[PDB]
Design a protein around this ligand. Structure first.
Ligand SMILES: O=S(=O)(c1ccc(O)cc1O)N1Cc2cc(O)cc(O)c2C1
Ligand SMILES: O=S(=O)(c1ccc(O)cc1O)N1Cc2cc(O)cc(O)c2C1
Lengths: 363, 363
């Protein structure tokens, strides 16, 4: 009873995704009136977001698109879009519509659970089948950043709806904590990373945390954020910092600690993790965020989580000494706005590159 | 007796500049035989470098190219190219050729002494005459990085020739010190910056230096480098770090020191300058390297000096606390290779951009 998927994809890809702020997410209520509004919003917005990214998948090199794992992920997106199309003519006033809608979103979330490693298998299939080439590699890098950020945003919308309209912390709004204690999340991530480090190395660096609350020196630092995302970033950073520290100190019984500073400024909430794990030459930094070289998407996905609400995650090393990693977040919920890729001329132009000599000299 | 400048520009712009390594610069001798070789090399290479960048000047927006200061700089480049064309048919075996050539290079260097602020006046003329627009601004940013790096490389070639073939430190090869003591340059830059800070604020932060020589912990860190370039970068960084520190501490008599770490690894020699000057939000970092917003090209030019021998200069702040600046240099003279822009299809494509919506969403 549905139209062919391409007809829906073309229709919805004409719209731009609509970025929401953390404050907008937070201010959304839980009444039946609010549930109807979420329904009518999401039966438009989710198809817009699904269609936009599906259109970019089609711009990938034939080589990457031809891989079975990429085709598999594509087929999931198609079915998920069609699942939502079933709701276009349904009455929001009917309670069964709303309950059925929530069930459909859960089914979609589950269907897409393994998207990240499935796409990674696609990248490997491309490399194995054809060998890699720099042009395709740049396109893959550009696309995957956008694809995975898209996915993060779709999961955010779905989680907010299912959590609110279907508990450990009742004070949270869906997955959002209006009073996230940053140092507590740092400690939780450290604890879990230490378990792993201790298992493999029988030792781990200690943690030291310092807070700089610029405007209110005595006050513990809190923010509006999704604690699971913050935890994810910190856990990945701790794993890298711990491994560097232990491996660079094979001979020592004394390990330098990992030092974390949490700073709260007027605009930024910044978290720096400093290790003395011997560092890495500058030349090798970019590789850490590469889907190719690391095909372990922990660091690039962590940086996407940071970028998702207008933040960033940056690494600066001193070879021979150690490495600083900094998570930059927006301090204010009103500045914390979804960063969403959009399918348009500008996007389309990025996949329209070819092999040639660079604009810089080689000997 | 010369052809029209465009005929020479077209001829020489077909070649790519030839990047030399620090080791190649260093290994060049001072005999009459070596002077002839430098002559025959430079009467080709300097025209290639002049022509390549002149071709890119022509790709600038009409608006920027139409400014009197940009046209003035263009006219200097034309005359300098023609000055060298006078030497195409001259005999390297004739001592007068060589002496005349050195005189011509000195005249060129002097002619171009004020290129940096003259171009900056061009940018201001563009802004005043037309108002600025984002497309032109991006083109200006791209071009100026390349133009000023080009200029650095041309001045390097000229200085090496005139210094070698026409002293405080006789151990230097032209402007290159094969045994540059990095901490000594840090101290020299600090001393000069402190003079300025003390003049205006009647106080300045102290300096602390720590060295990490990974492979040889006891040994003072030395490298092959051009000390004036290193001094330039450190002086600019100290001025910023000092101003931040004093201005963020208006009420205090105790100023936090500026801490410098010099680390020597297998591949990198890294110099970190850390201040507690209160920092800056991430949003405002990019502006520091902008020719537009800072129209004070101290930071962007400093970063070009770092990039010139395959290094970099990076800033990471923690708003509410302070800022780290890191100069990344190649530890090895063989890795220290000129980074030279080249005029080709790839370069040409960058000026072929236009106004449109970005590939990312706006609310
Ligand atoms: O690149 S690192 O500087 C680094 C990268 C990311 C990060 O968040 C922290 C880091 O120290 N590091 C050095 C090293 C040495 C090892 O022996 C094993 C490692 O996993 C590593 C990792
Ligand atoms: O951007 S900063 O963090 C900075 C930029 C570059 C650098 O090398 C060091 C820095 O601290 N800094 C803060 C601030 C406050 C002032 O009142 C005056 C200043 O000049 C500044 C400069």
């Amino acid at each position: 009873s549905l139209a062919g998927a391409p007809k829906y994809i073309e229709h919805f890809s004409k719209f731009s995704p609509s970025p929401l702020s953390m404050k907008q997410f937070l201010d959304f209520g839980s009444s039946n009136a609010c549930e109807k509004t979420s329904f009518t919003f999401l039966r438009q917005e989710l198809p817009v977001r699904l269609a936009n990214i599906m259109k970019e998948i089609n711009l990938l090199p034939d080589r990457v698109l031809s891989t079975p794992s990429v085709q598999l992920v594509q087929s999931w997106y198609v079915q998920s879009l069609l699942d939502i199309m079933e709701f276009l003519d349904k009455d929001p006033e009917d309670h069964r519509t709303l309950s059925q809608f929530t069930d459909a979103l859960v089914t979609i979330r589950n269907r897409h659970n393994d998207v990240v490693p499935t796409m990674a298998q696609g990248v490997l299939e491309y490399k194995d089948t054809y060998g890699d080439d720099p042009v395709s590699n740049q396109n893959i890098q550009y696309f995957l950043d956008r694809f995975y950020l898209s996915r993060i945003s779709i999961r955010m919308l779905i989680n907010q709806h299912t959590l609110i309209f279907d508990p450990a912390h009742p004070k949270h709004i869906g997955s959002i904590d209006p009073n996230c204690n940053v140092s507590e999340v740092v400690k939780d991530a450290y604890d879990m990373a230490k378990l792993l480090c201790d298992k493999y190395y029988m030792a781990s660096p200690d943690l030291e945390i310092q807070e700089i609350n610029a405007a209110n020196s005595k006050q513990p630092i809190h923010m509006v954020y999704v604690p699971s995302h913050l935890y994810h970033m910190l856990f990945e950073l701790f794993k890298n910092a711990m491994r560097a520290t232990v491996e660079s100190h094979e001979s020592s019984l004394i390990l330098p600690p990992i030092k974390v500073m949490v700073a709260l400024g007027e605009e930024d909430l910044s978290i720096k993790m400093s290790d003395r794990g011997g560092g890495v030459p500058l030349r090798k930094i970019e590789r850490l965020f590469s889907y190719m070289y690391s095909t372990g998407y922990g660091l690039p996905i962590s940086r996407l989580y940071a970028k998702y609400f207008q933040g960033d995650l940056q690494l600066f090393s001193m070879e021979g000494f150690g490495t600083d990693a900094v998570i930059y977040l927006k301090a204010l919920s009103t500045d914390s706005v979804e960063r969403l890729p959009v399918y348009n001329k500008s996007a389309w132009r990025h996949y329209q590159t070819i092999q040639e000599a660079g604009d810089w000299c080689v000997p």
